[PDB]
């Protein structure tokens, strides 16, 4: 393991071979686990030299070594990635994509992935330099299965970074050019390719309805639903996120998710041991119950109300919070019959128990569900019958103490509930 000083010497020699030996030595240093001396290599002014070696077509070994060395530097902080880009590395790396040498092309893929992964500005700059055509050409084979596994995973991951951040989101024509290939990857058998593919789709669906639409039009929902029930957490997580983003769109878009059979997967998702899965499953449910009355009926038919009642009863506070939203949306847009069914499932007790929460936000969401529920009772003149259940559980108190509160909306609704159904 050479010293940075010696590496500088080798690179400064006008000896191609000496430069090769010094670059490899640089690569090995930047490969350590114990904090690679990235900042020193940068201050030493080596980046421009490395970028220069990327263009030495007659010495592929130094193309590889320097590509690798640059990749690890680009894998650092934004300041470090910026250094690589500032060195002119982008067009040099795109030129390597078409190298007859797979290991070199692969490093270029990897390098661009880290550059694009720094943020939207670098992501777009990489796109402006025309990285998309070359990248897509690499996956231009009839059956993905004939590609080396490790190589396919790298490309997938890099394409994923080209889909990622939101300020701004990737260029629309870039997304369109990418989608077809991305969809082939979403249908591939490698568990890692499947995971990153799902992350890419989850990014493309994090935005305006128009964004969700171009992904939905590619018929990916059914595959997403299938992945939604995979046995690997790494696949489930991004699939559920993508599903979650899609149900934030139009009711027509949400219906594609329900038609694909997504709801049958929620019994296990809403009881998943993984706190995060449970929380995003409930979130997804709250945007489904915010749909039409016929979609709320689908929630009911799949027997998901008891599951919502359960999560609201016992779960991480953040999961319970989404549950409240789900119930408030359900109570807000559902029929009288659907709301009655909700009460027969036992929503009152656990909903009351949450009024003690120390989070003003969940108290407003719940008092809202209570208003909604009473409003339904009113059409059944069974108001008084509910007004007792809420006393029973011991809610008449919490709504009572919620009069003498602090946040207006709260004691405004609290009080409004008292004088009208109780006192």
């Amino acid at each position: 393991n050479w010293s940075v000083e010696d590496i500088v010497k080798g690179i400064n020699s006008n000896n191609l071979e000496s430069q090769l030996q010094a670059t490899q030595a640089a690569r090995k240093l930047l490969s350590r686990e114990k904090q690679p001396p990235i900042d020193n290599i940068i201050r030493a002014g080596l980046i421009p030299k490395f970028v220069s070696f990327l263009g030495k077509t007659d010495c592929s070994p130094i193309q590889f070594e320097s590509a690798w060395a640059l990749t690890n530097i680009a894998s650092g902080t934004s300041e470090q990635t910026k250094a690589v880009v500032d060195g002119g590395a982008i067009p040099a790396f795109i030129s390597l994509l078409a190298s007859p040498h797979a290991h070199i092309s692969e490093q270029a893929v990897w390098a661009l992935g880290n550059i694009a992964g720094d943020g939207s500005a670098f992501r777009d700059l990489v796109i402006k330099h025309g990285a998309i055509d070359p990248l897509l050409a690499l996956l231009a084979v009839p059956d993905l299965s004939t590609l080396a596994c490790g190589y396919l995973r790298n490309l997938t991951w890099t394409l994923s970074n080209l889909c990622r951040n939101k300020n701004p989101a990737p260029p629309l024509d870039a997304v369109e050019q990418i989608l077809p290939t991305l969809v082939r990857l979403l249908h591939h058998n490698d568990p890692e390719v499947l995971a990153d593919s799902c992350w890419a789709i989850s990014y493309l669906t994090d935005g305006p309805n128009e964004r969700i639409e171009m992904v939905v039009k590619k018929g990916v929902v059914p595959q997403l639903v299938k992945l939604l029930g995979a046995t690997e957490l790494p696949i489930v997580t991004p699939a559920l996120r993508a599903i979650g983003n899609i149900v934030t769109g139009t009711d027509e878009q949400t219906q594609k998710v329900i038609d694909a059979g997504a709801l049958a997967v929620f019994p296990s998702l809403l009881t998943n041991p993984k706190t995060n899965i449970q929380k995003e499953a409930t979130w997804t449910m709250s945007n489904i119950t915010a749909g039409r009355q016929d979609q709320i009926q689908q929630v009911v038919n799949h027997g998901l109300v008891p599951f919502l009642v359960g999560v609201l009863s016992k779960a991480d506070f953040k999961t319970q919070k989404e549950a409240a939203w789900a119930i408030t949306n359900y109570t807000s847009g559902g029929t009288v019959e659907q709301i009655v069914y909700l009460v027969h499932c036992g929503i009152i007790e656990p909903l009351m128990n949450l009024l003690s929460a120390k989070d003003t936000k969940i108290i407003q969401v719940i008092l809202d569900a209570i208003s909604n529920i009473f409003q339904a009772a009113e059409k059944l003149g069974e108001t008084e019958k509910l007004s007792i259940m809420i006393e029973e559980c011991g809610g008449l108190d919490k709504i009572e103490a919620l009069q003498r509160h602090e946040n207006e909306s709260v004691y405004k609704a609290s009080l409004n509930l008292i004088e009208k159904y109780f006192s």
Partner: peptide, 10 residues
Amino acid sequence: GKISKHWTGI
């Protein structure tokens, strides 16, 4: 987000 590589060596 970002990932570095490390092995080989000749």
